[PDB]
Amino acid sequence: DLWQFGKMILKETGKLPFPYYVTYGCYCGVGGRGGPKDATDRCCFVHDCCYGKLTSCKPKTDRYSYSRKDGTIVCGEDPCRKEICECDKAAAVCFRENLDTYNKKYMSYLKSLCKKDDC
Amino acid sequence: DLWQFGKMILKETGKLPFPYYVTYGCYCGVGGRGGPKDATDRCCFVHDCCYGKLTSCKPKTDRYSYSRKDGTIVCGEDPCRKEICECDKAAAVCFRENLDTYNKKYMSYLKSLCKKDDC
């Protein structure tokens, strides 16, 4: 579910998707049109590829089951639901692991400075 | 400030910008490339025009002053800050006034079904 994904992001990074990630860099914030500007930017790219591999699933509408009671996201128990959940988990963890280099200057970055990797 | 704008949205509509509005319809969720699909969609268009009129300002980076202690957004007291704040207020109020017709089916709507109004 796109909402569940946004919570994982909030819970794992302490930042709300908007505007911190919905408008970041050349990929996350430009529809994935430009090439990733840094590690955090690359997390979005890796996320799309993860979804790309789930052909028979509806990664954006299916509501899966997960928990984070003790600090770590654990996907509950639908082959699609679980796979979708893993993709989301990975990305939330990716944004977290890269908070060390998150650049606020890339927030709402400009398209004309973006270039362009394939899954 | 893009963050302040997102809070006004949250406070006025009870919905988090992402994914409810960042990915809605043909304008809000498609960079403003396609024509508005409905009233809520149109709110984003009206918001961009509002910013468009603030040439000497940085509508996305300037942090203004506002309050909503008693249920109504009131912009505190920089000519730019105040104007930016009004734009944000109007849009938050626009999303609110149109919750009555908000369509969840337009969330992450498809670009190929979008068409295309000028400020």
Side-chain angles (χ1 to χ4, degrees):
Chain A
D1 196 63
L2 244 48
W3 173 81
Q4 304 185 282
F5 176 44
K7 298 290 292 180
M8 300 193 159
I9 293 178
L10 167 71
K11 292 178 181 182
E12 286 291 330
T13 75
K15 294 174 183 298
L16 281 164
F18 171 88
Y20 297 108
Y21 295 99
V22 291
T23 81
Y24 184 101
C26 291
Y27 196 89
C28 303
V30 185
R33 288 178 272 175
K37 206 72 174 181
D38 72 339
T40 293
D41 210 3
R42 207 177 189 85
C43 296
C44 297
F45 174 53
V46 174
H47 186 236
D48 290 330
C49 297
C50 196
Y51 275 13
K53 296 189 172 182
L54 307 177
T55 55
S56 291
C57 310
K58 310 191 199 184
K60 300 186 155 198
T61 268
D62 216 341
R63 175 159 274 164
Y64 47 71
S65 181
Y66 82 102
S67 180
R68 199 185 180 276
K69 306 191 173 181
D70 297 297
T72 79
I73 300 170
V74 174
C75 296
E77 110 183 351
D78 212 86
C80 273
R81 293 173 188 305
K82 192 181 171 179
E83 283 311 319
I84 301 171
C85 184
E86 286 305 323
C87 288
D88 288 359
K89 171 167 178 173
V93 165
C94 185
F95 291 134
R96 188 191 80 216
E97 287 288 302
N98 291 285
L99 271 172
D100 183 6
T101 44
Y102 180 94
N103 258 305
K104 192 169 176 176
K105 66 211 187 177
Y106 292 156
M107 195 150 57
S108 198
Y109 197 63
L110 337 56
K111 46 199 172 166
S112 297
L113 297 180
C114 294
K115 321 154 185 299
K116 187 179 59 182
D117 262 30
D118 178 52
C119 296
Chain B
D1 196 63
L2 244 48
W3 173 81
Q4 304 185 282
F5 176 44
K7 298 290 292 180
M8 300 193 159
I9 293 178
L10 167 71
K11 292 178 181 182
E12 286 291 330
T13 75
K15 294 174 183 298
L16 281 164
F18 171 88
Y20 297 108
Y21 295 99
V22 291
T23 81
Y24 184 101
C26 291
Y27 196 89
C28 303
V30 185
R33 288 178 272 175
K37 206 72 174 181
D38 72 339
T40 293
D41 210 3
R42 207 177 189 85
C43 296
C44 297
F45 174 53
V46 174
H47 186 236
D48 290 330
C49 297
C50 196
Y51 275 13
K53 296 189 172 182
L54 307 177
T55 55
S56 291
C57 310
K58 310 191 199 184
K60 300 186 155 198
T61 268
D62 216 341
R63 175 159 274 164
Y64 47 71
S65 181
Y66 82 102
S67 180
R68 199 185 180 276
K69 306 191 173 181
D70 297 297
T72 79
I73 300 170
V74 174
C75 296
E77 110 183 351
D78 212 86
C80 273
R81 293 173 188 305
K82 192 181 171 179
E83 283 311 319
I84 301 171
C85 184
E86 286 305 323
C87 288
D88 288 359
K89 171 167 178 173
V93 165
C94 185
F95 291 134
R96 188 191 80 216
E97 287 288 302
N98 291 285
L99 271 172
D100 183 6
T101 44
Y102 180 94
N103 258 305
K104 192 169 176 176
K105 66 211 187 177
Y106 292 156
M107 195 150 57
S108 198
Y109 197 63
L110 337 56
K111 46 199 172 166
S112 297
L113 297 180
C114 294
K115 321 154 185 299
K116 187 179 59 182
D117 262 30
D118 178 52
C119 296

